[PDB]
Curated annotation (Swiss-Prot), chains B, D, G, H, J, L:
Cysteines joined through disulfide linkages: C6-C11
Gene: INS
The organism of origin for this protein: Homo sapiens
Listed name of the protein: Insulin A chain
Coiled-coil spans in chain: none
Length: 29, 21, 28, 21, 29, 28, 21, 21, 28, 21, 29, 21
């Protein structure tokens, strides 16, 4: 897996891939 | 939260998975 | 009928823009 | 749900807001 | 709506979403 | 037959790369 | 133009809509 | 138009340039 | 059946995330 | 190949890794 | 064609477009 | 390599095509 800052739309796309069927929550502070 | 851990800093795959349901 | 996996990819980016700091939950 | 509502028809910004926290 | 710098492909994707049926013009200076 | 909304999303990004500072107009 | 207003600086939704047809 | 030309077949960079300003 | 050109666009981004510094080869 | 495997069904991160260098 | 830094997912998407049928190799150092 | 040429620096279209098969 990539070793990098993930921000904004890239972070949510990472989450989408990584979490698969589980889904995810994107709740920035 | 996720911005501090993975955007401001760099997340491992395991760390990113903390935000899966 | 559209590929759900591709649609979902698109929707989470759109939700990112629309929701901003509100955030959102997503599950396939 | 968003996939049922927004994959075969276009959800505007206004409709997509329903799915926000 | 997000409160952030939008640049490059992200700006054009924002435009695509926001403008919907109206469409848009991307004419950088 | 392909979802026009998804295709359009893709095309505007491709146009961004191809057109550069020329820019472009797009309408669905 | 749009780069100066929304990339270099930050645009509101209203400001972004100035570039819709 | 671009959608008619480039959604069911692949437009190369060369074809896509037609749609530039 | 899904548009191969759109699928490929998605897959190369996913491969980018998954592969990281390993990299990858892609051909349509 | 990846298109045959991963376009009509979802390849997880784990399956996608097969296609890495 | 755009005149800009292309990095990360944007670089691979550029490659995907530019290389077309030829395909490409993304092998960062 | 490609990061040094096109990410760290800026690539021409010709330079980017050096990474096509
Ligand atoms: Cl970016
Ligand atoms: Cl994915
Ligand atoms: Cl999107
Ligand atoms: Cl949408
Ligand atoms: Cl959209
Ligand atoms: Cl694209
Ligand atoms: Cl294209
Ligand atoms: Cl993707
Ligand atoms: Cl995928
Ligand atoms: Cl493309
Ligand atoms: Zn980006
Ligand atoms: Zn995927
Ligand atoms: Zn959309
Ligand atoms: Zn394309």
């Amino acid at each position: 897996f990539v070793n990098q800052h993930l921000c904004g739309s890239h972070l949510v796309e990472a989450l989408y891939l990584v979490c698969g069927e589980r889904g995810f929550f994107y709740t920035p502070k | 939260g996720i911005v501090e851990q993975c955007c401001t800093s760099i997340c491992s795959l395991y760390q990113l998975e903390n935000y899966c349901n």
